[PDB]
Design an enzyme around this catalytic site. Structure first.
Site, PDB file in Angstrom:
ATOM      1  N   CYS A 108      37.936  48.603  48.392  1.00  0.00           N
ATOM      2  CA  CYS A 108      37.122  47.506  47.958  1.00  0.00           C
ATOM      3  C   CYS A 108      36.331  48.466  46.682  1.00  0.00           C
ATOM      4  O   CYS A 108      35.487  49.133  47.152  1.00  0.00           O
ATOM      5  CB  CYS A 108      36.103  47.043  48.605  1.00  0.00           C
ATOM      6  SG  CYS A 108      34.775  45.885  47.880  1.00  0.00           S
ATOM      7  N   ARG A 111      31.899  47.968  46.400  1.00  0.00           N
ATOM      8  CA  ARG A 111      30.748  48.235  47.491  1.00  0.00           C
ATOM      9  C   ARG A 111      29.428  48.687  46.863  1.00  0.00           C
ATOM     10  O   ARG A 111      28.691  48.953  47.798  1.00  0.00           O
ATOM     11  CB  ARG A 111      31.634  49.444  48.308  1.00  0.00           C
ATOM     12  CG  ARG A 111      32.655  48.738  49.162  1.00  0.00           C
ATOM     13  CD  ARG A 111      33.182  49.751  50.094  1.00  0.00           C
ATOM     14  NE  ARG A 111      34.311  50.702  49.342  1.00  0.00           N
ATOM     15  CZ  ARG A 111      34.618  51.722  49.749  1.00  0.00           C
ATOM     16  NH1 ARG A 111      34.069  52.190  50.897  1.00  0.00           N
ATOM     17  NH2 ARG A 111      35.490  52.467  48.987  1.00  0.00           N
ATOM     18  N   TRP A 280      32.291  38.013  43.783  1.00  0.00           N
ATOM     19  CA  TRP A 280      32.654  37.659  42.457  1.00  0.00           C
ATOM     20  C   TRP A 280      33.949  38.385  41.748  1.00  0.00           C
ATOM     21  O   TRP A 280      33.953  39.396  42.346  1.00  0.00           O
ATOM     22  CB  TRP A 280      31.326  37.700  41.447  1.00  0.00           C
ATOM     23  CG  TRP A 280      30.640  38.992  41.455  1.00  0.00           C
ATOM     24  CD1 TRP A 280      30.972  40.164  40.503  1.00  0.00           C
ATOM     25  CD2 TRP A 280      29.448  39.395  42.121  1.00  0.00           C
ATOM     26  NE1 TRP A 280      30.377  40.970  40.675  1.00  0.00           N
ATOM     27  CE2 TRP A 280      29.214  40.700  41.616  1.00  0.00           C
ATOM     28  CE3 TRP A 280      28.678  38.664  42.871  1.00  0.00           C
ATOM     29  CZ2 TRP A 280      28.092  41.551  42.124  1.00  0.00           C
ATOM     30  CZ3 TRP A 280      27.368  39.466  43.170  1.00  0.00           C
ATOM     31  CH2 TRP A 280      27.338  40.668  42.827  1.00  0.00           C
ATOM     32  N   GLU A 285      41.588  41.030  38.240  1.00  0.00           N
ATOM     33  CA  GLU A 285      42.243  40.187  39.470  1.00  0.00           C
ATOM     34  C   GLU A 285      42.696  38.728  38.747  1.00  0.00           C
ATOM     35  O   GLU A 285      43.749  38.560  39.294  1.00  0.00           O
ATOM     36  CB  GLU A 285      41.069  39.650  40.610  1.00  0.00           C
ATOM     37  CG  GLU A 285      40.321  41.216  41.093  1.00  0.00           C
ATOM     38  CD  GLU A 285      39.353  40.763  42.233  1.00  0.00           C
ATOM     39  OE1 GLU A 285      39.884  40.173  43.095  1.00  0.00           O
ATOM     40  OE2 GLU A 285      38.008  40.889  41.863  1.00  0.00           O
TER      41      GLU A 285
HETATM   42  C1  HEM Z   1      30.713  41.226  45.158  1.00  0.00           C
HETATM   43  C2  HEM Z   1      31.860  41.686  44.327  1.00  0.00           C
HETATM   44  C3  HEM Z   1      33.286  42.192  44.723  1.00  0.00           C
HETATM   45  C4  HEM Z   1      33.908  42.613  43.820  1.00  0.00           C
HETATM   46  C5  HEM Z   1      34.023  42.756  42.270  1.00  0.00           C
HETATM   47  C6  HEM Z   1      35.074  43.155  44.644  1.00  0.00           C
HETATM   48  C7  HEM Z   1      36.317  43.978  44.099  1.00  0.00           C
HETATM   49  C8  HEM Z   1      37.505  43.883  44.800  1.00  0.00           C
HETATM   50  C9  HEM Z   1      38.710  44.033  44.422  1.00  0.00           C
HETATM   51  C10 HEM Z   1      39.259  44.049  43.097  1.00  0.00           C
HETATM   52  C11 HEM Z   1      39.550  44.151  45.607  1.00  0.00           C
HETATM   53  C12 HEM Z   1      41.111  44.323  45.561  1.00  0.00           C
HETATM   54  C13 HEM Z   1      41.868  43.032  45.647  1.00  0.00           C
HETATM   55  C14 HEM Z   1      42.868  43.150  44.942  1.00  0.00           C
HETATM   56  O1  HEM Z   1      42.992  43.790  43.602  1.00  0.00           O
HETATM   57  O2  HEM Z   1      44.009  42.338  45.194  1.00  0.00           O
HETATM   58  C15 HEM Z   1      38.808  44.209  46.684  1.00  0.00           C
HETATM   59  C16 HEM Z   1      39.352  44.448  48.179  1.00  0.00           C
HETATM   60  C17 HEM Z   1      38.287  44.103  49.445  1.00  0.00           C
HETATM   61  N1  HEM Z   1      37.021  43.665  49.188  1.00  0.00           N
HETATM   62 FE1  HEM Z   1      35.764  43.499  47.751  1.00  0.00          FE
HETATM   63  N2  HEM Z   1      34.892  42.876  45.948  1.00  0.00           N
HETATM   64  C18 HEM Z   1      33.595  42.420  46.180  1.00  0.00           C
HETATM   65  C19 HEM Z   1      32.929  41.824  46.998  1.00  0.00           C
HETATM   66  C20 HEM Z   1      33.388  41.913  48.516  1.00  0.00           C
HETATM   67  C21 HEM Z   1      32.783  41.545  49.650  1.00  0.00           C
HETATM   68  C22 HEM Z   1      31.556  40.627  49.560  1.00  0.00           C
HETATM   69  C23 HEM Z   1      33.441  41.885  50.829  1.00  0.00           C
HETATM   70  C24 HEM Z   1      33.258  41.562  52.187  1.00  0.00           C
HETATM   71  C25 HEM Z   1      32.047  41.272  52.760  1.00  0.00           C
HETATM   72  C26 HEM Z   1      34.597  42.606  50.013  1.00  0.00           C
HETATM   73  C27 HEM Z   1      35.392  43.229  50.923  1.00  0.00           C
HETATM   74  C28 HEM Z   1      36.680  43.849  50.575  1.00  0.00           C
HETATM   75  C29 HEM Z   1      37.729  43.930  51.508  1.00  0.00           C
HETATM   76  C30 HEM Z   1      37.829  44.144  52.772  1.00  0.00           C
HETATM   77  C31 HEM Z   1      38.792  44.259  50.664  1.00  0.00           C
HETATM   78  C32 HEM Z   1      40.169  44.817  51.133  1.00  0.00           C
HETATM   79  C33 HEM Z   1      41.364  43.877  50.612  1.00  0.00           C
HETATM   80  C34 HEM Z   1      42.526  44.069  51.619  1.00  0.00           C
HETATM   81  O3  HEM Z   1      42.493  45.142  52.328  1.00  0.00           O
HETATM   82  O4  HEM Z   1      43.622  43.495  51.242  1.00  0.00           O
HETATM   83  N3  HEM Z   1      34.564  42.772  48.901  1.00  0.00           N
HETATM   84  N4  HEM Z   1      37.449  44.041  46.239  1.00  0.00           N
HETATM   85  N1  LIG Z   2      36.737  39.703  43.567  1.00  0.00           N
HETATM   86  C1  LIG Z   2      36.909  40.104  44.987  1.00  0.00           C
HETATM   87  C2  LIG Z   2      35.860  40.089  45.866  1.00  0.00           C
HETATM   88  C3  LIG Z   2      36.116  40.332  47.263  1.00  0.00           C
HETATM   89  C4  LIG Z   2      37.538  40.417  47.692  1.00  0.00           C
HETATM   90  C5  LIG Z   2      38.662  40.512  46.688  1.00  0.00           C
HETATM   91  N2  LIG Z   2      38.257  40.310  45.402  1.00  0.00           N
HETATM   92  C6  LIG Z   2      39.762  40.763  47.229  1.00  0.00           C
HETATM   93  C7  LIG Z   2      40.216  40.768  48.208  1.00  0.00           C
HETATM   94  O1  LIG Z   2      41.464  41.005  48.881  1.00  0.00           O
HETATM   95  C8  LIG Z   2      42.319  40.044  48.144  1.00  0.00           C
HETATM   96  C9  LIG Z   2      43.699  40.450  48.575  1.00  0.00           C
HETATM   97  C10 LIG Z   2      44.680  40.960  47.509  1.00  0.00           C
HETATM   98  C11 LIG Z   2      45.877  41.330  47.747  1.00  0.00           C
HETATM   99  C12 LIG Z   2      46.270  41.312  49.139  1.00  0.00           C
HETATM  100  C13 LIG Z   2      45.587  40.851  50.143  1.00  0.00           C
HETATM  101  C14 LIG Z   2      45.778  40.972  51.592  1.00  0.00           C
HETATM  102  N3  LIG Z   2      46.111  39.721  52.196  1.00  0.00           N
HETATM  103  C15 LIG Z   2      47.505  39.129  51.893  1.00  0.00           C
HETATM  104  C16 LIG Z   2      48.697  40.168  51.786  1.00  0.00           C
HETATM  105  C17 LIG Z   2      49.537  39.906  50.724  1.00  0.00           C
HETATM  106  C18 LIG Z   2      50.549  40.948  50.781  1.00  0.00           C
HETATM  107  C19 LIG Z   2      50.755  42.063  51.597  1.00  0.00           C
HETATM  108  C20 LIG Z   2      49.687  42.167  52.512  1.00  0.00           C
HETATM  109  N4  LIG Z   2      48.620  41.235  52.542  1.00  0.00           N
HETATM  110  C21 LIG Z   2      44.269  40.605  49.778  1.00  0.00           C
HETATM  111  C22 LIG Z   2      39.175  40.727  49.350  1.00  0.00           C
HETATM  112  C23 LIG Z   2      37.703  40.827  48.992  1.00  0.00           C
END
Ligand code: HEM
Ligand SMILES: Nc1ccc2c(n1)CC(OCc1cccc(CNCc3ccccn3)c1)=CC2
Ligand code: HEM
Ligand SMILES: Nc1ccc2c(n1)CC(OCc1cccc(CNCc3ccccn3)c1)=CC2
Ligand SMILES: C[C@H](O)[C@H](O)[C@H]1CNc2nc(N)[nH]c(=O)c2N1
Ligand SMILES: C[C@H](O)[C@H](O)[C@H]1CNc2nc(N)[nH]c(=O)c2N1
Ligand SMILES: [Zn+2]
Lengths: 411, 407
Positions: A108, A111, A280, A285
């Site tokens: 993330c 953070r 947000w 994204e």
């Molecule tokens: C507030 C603004 C936030 C921004 C700008 C942000 C940004 C991101 C981005 C760009 C990703 C990658 C997702 C992708 O590219 O597909 C991500 C992943 C993640 N975010 Fe954040 N995030 C935010 C808030 C949060 C919050 C509030 C939480 C949880 C309370 C969180 C938990 C996570 C988690 C667990 C992942 C892992 C996704 C995965 O493992 O598939 N984020 N975040």
């Molecule tokens: N701006 C923000 C704010 C908060 C968050 C995000 N963005 C984005 C985000 O994660 C979004 C995500 C993207 C790709 C795959 C997954 C995972 N779930 C489905 C999957 C598909 C394919 C392979 C594995 N898993 C999740 C979590 C929090």
């Protein structure tokens, strides 16, 4: 054992000790790295160790480690586990746990915000209608008329795994996708399978390119139910470009609030299978992945034609050129409508500051380079040149299988 | 144990067994992944040589033949007596091509079997080294029709007699600190440009000064050699649309020729093995030109485009970065110098991966290095899961010689 990481653009070196608190496993070994693998039922036996460790953490954070408040809580949890086979977190512990699961999410980039998380305790929820109401209030609170606020809503923890709360949607707000008989897709190709389940469960589909999906909500292991989010709660932004007047004519919009709802929150051994959270958008994204991925809306070709780019050979970088303009339009549209958004330059810069701060005050910051580096213009952001250590801390957010592949249907 | 990798853009799933032949260690554990870290006697030698001869005779379908067992005992006797051994030319070519094939950080490995191997193990002096290097450069350059090549100098014997090319690449531009405070030329080469002057080199003190070669034979002091300019193909950089782009005064050399790595074959170490292929466009445009620690010309370019540089959310850097990289490709292509764009190269690599899973059982790959430094997710490798492991023969990093050499 101390571990160092280097920023190769600034030569700043940082020392990680926090990885010593790492319990879970990465998937890697001494002979193979699974760094790019996308994904690399619990009894009283292992629960109290998991609970005691969390409580040790909790009371350390509030500077009461070893206090009578600490020892009594441990005793209380012990007796609750040995007689009820589970236990309940206090409100203070739940809030700490949710915040630290976000703090610990190594993938993330957002953070820096982890301590300003609004936690809604929905553990008294019992029915899907009750879930819908809690989700509506989440969406309204988090949206805040475009001044987005981070929020998580936590539904009751798993018990025997036969009474799970689940949100069947992958995000609370997402557009439907419709496979056409001719092989093309209308709407978001990411959501075709979920859309079909919705349609089968009785959802009347408008069959448009930007139809907000219904909520499919599962309480206490019962069959999920359909609810339509009130449209006045779904903030959407029409996508236009600051210089290209034809861009609005592409008819694109996106929703304001990214709210992930299919993950599992683990706190002290308890499993919260329904914990929709939201913050947000970082503009890439939407602009890079949601619109330009080949397996998504894939408007790159049409933007390229309208720009009149040399599309005959890829070495004209027409794809790269079209992607930048789409991403310019996304940020322009959100800022013009005063909906919170962050460009990838600002977010990665903030992450580096957060990470240095986390190394100084916490001894580490687990970080997944493969996910932190943005999907466009990677090396002109400061995380590209940052060495990063990835390891799993708890509390944590975990993946879980899609509920329609595990669910026992009642009928 | 028989691992699977998925492409999430195409659902293609490949099954990897080659990793079980992996030998060296990754730096990772089950508790911590180091995937983004830049750098993690007489008795260990015969097992190493046996491993390599075992795959060599298997690759020619003569595993367990008399020739196999005879070579095995022959090398074994050589080691028992001479404490090392020498590779046959055929085993040397094989080991070099497979070090490239095993280079998990290299997106260009679809070309691995077309490598031109120049055996320079008879070399004894820096003047000799220079000659081999000039032939390399001219062969590889081929008047712009670039060809892959490696030149292998004598193997290490005891660390006292190392052959080393002190340059990081054969061709690189000089860099100087200014009295003003900033940096003229290439900042990555500041310390080497200093070592050269602090060695006797007279710098033109320009922006694009081709560095001299600093060659070390048999562990002696290195000697300077100017690569003849008619062997150094350069491309003047212009934009196919913006006429003001020429006025920026940019050029780059056509030959990427890495020369500081160590080639390991059958336990033998080749400390001097300069090799060369051709550029992917983003290596020059994204990294060489726009890294803050490099030429960093992003602001000047955006200014000349009259882009709103007041907030980052205008994506002015992204817009400029793309134009720069369009210009690099357009320049090389117009001048008939081989170059590949990141879209073509990554598409080749996906194909190369499919080939290796099909005909070899896998392909070690380092996602953090395979994915290009721009436009990552619109290339097929972004969505490709990859398994990273260290196979041998291999190219390895080695310390810079000026920290080691007994001066
Ligand atoms: C507030 C603004 C936030 C921004 C700008 C942000 C940004 C991101 C981005 C760009 C990703 C990658 C997702 C992708 O590219 O597909 C991500 C992943 C993640 N975010 Fe954040 N995030 C935010 C808030 C949060 C919050 C509030 C939480 C949880 C309370 C969180 C938990 C996570 C988690 C667990 C992942 C892992 C996704 C995965 O493992 O598939 N984020 N975040
Ligand atoms: N701006 C923000 C704010 C908060 C968050 C995000 N963005 C984005 C985000 O994660 C979004 C995500 C993207 C790709 C795959 C997954 C995972 N779930 C489905 C999957 C598909 C394919 C392979 C594995 N898993 C999740 C979590 C929090
Ligand atoms: C022929 C065209 C080739 C292309 C397009 C190519 C492309 C690349 C690129 C883009 C990188 C990452 C470099 C960076 O980001 O700065 C790389 C790394 C590498 N290449 Fe290739 N390459 C080619 C040929 C070769 C050859 C001929 C060899 C050896 C015989 C080789 C061995 C390597 C190695 C060992 C690395 C990784 C070095 C390290 O670990 O830091 N490459 N290549
Ligand atoms: N077109 C082609 C063809 C072939 C090759 C390359 N390109 C590029 C390449 O290597 C690209 C590289 C990039 C950054 C750092 C390094 C490693 N330099 C040593 C170092 C110093 C300090 C910190 C880390 N590493 C190497 C090898 C072969
Ligand atoms: C921090 C990270 O290890 C370092 O910046 C790497 C990232 N990925 C890279 N990828 C390539 N192809 N070349 C590089 O020099 C780097 N640098
Ligand atoms: C193969 C690879 O692990 C996968 O496609 C990842 C790569 N990095 C990513 N990074 C982010 N932020 N989001 C993603 O979905 C992905 N996908
Ligand atoms: Zn790893």
């Amino acid at each position: 054992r101390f571990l160092k990481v280097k920023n190769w653009e600034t030569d700043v070196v940082l020392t990680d000790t926090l990885h010593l608190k790492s319990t879970l496993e990465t998937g890697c070994t001494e002979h193979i790295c699974m760094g790019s693998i996308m994904l690399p039922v619990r009894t009283k036996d292992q629960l109290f160790p998991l609970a005691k460790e969390f409580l040790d953490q909790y009371y350390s954070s509030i500077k009461r480690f070893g206090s009578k408040a600490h020892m009594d809580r441990l005793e209380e949890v012990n007796k609750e586990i040995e007689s009820t086979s589970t236990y309940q977190l206090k409100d203070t512990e739940l809030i700490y746990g949710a915040k630290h699961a976000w703090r610990n999410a190594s993938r993330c980039v957002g953070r820096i915000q982890w301590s300003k998380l609004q936690v809604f305790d929905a553990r008294d929820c019992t029915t899907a209608h009750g879930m819908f109401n809690y989700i509506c209030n989440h969406v309204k609170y988090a949206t805040n008329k475009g001044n987005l606020r981070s929020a998580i809503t936590i539904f009751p923890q798993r018990t025997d795994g036969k009474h799970d709360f689940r949100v069947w949607n992958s995000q609370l707000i997402r557009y439907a996708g419709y496979k056409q008989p001719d092989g093309s897709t209308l709407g978001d190709p990411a959501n075709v399978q979920f859309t079909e389940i919705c349609i089968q469960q009785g959802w009347k589909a408008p069959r448009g390119r930007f139809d907000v999906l219904p909520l499919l909500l599962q309480a206490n292991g019962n069959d999920p139910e359909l609810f339509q989010i009130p449209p006045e709660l779904v903030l959407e932004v029409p996508i236009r470009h600051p210089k290209f007047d034809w861009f609005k004519d592409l008819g694109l919009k996106w929703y304001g609030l990214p709210a992930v709802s299919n993950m599992l929150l683990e706190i002290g051994g308890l499993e919260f299978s329904a914990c929709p959270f939201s913050g947000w958008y970082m503009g890439t994204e939407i602009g890079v992945r949601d619109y330009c991925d080949n397996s998504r809306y894939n408007i790159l070709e049409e933007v390229a034609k309208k720009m009149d780019l040399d599309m005959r050979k890829t070495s004209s970088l027409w794809k790269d050129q079209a992607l930048v303009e789409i991403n310019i339009a996304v940020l322009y549209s959100f800022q013009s409508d005063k909906v919170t958004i962050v460009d990838h330059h600002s977010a990665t810069e903030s992450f580096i500051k957060h990470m240095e701060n986390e190394y100084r005050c916490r001894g580490g910051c687990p970080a997944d380079w493969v996910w932190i580096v943005p999907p466009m213009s990677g090396s002109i952001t400061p995380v590209f040149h940052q060495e990063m250590l990835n390891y799993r801390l708890t509390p944590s957010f975990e993946y879980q299988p899609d509920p329609w592949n595990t669910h026992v249907w009642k009928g």
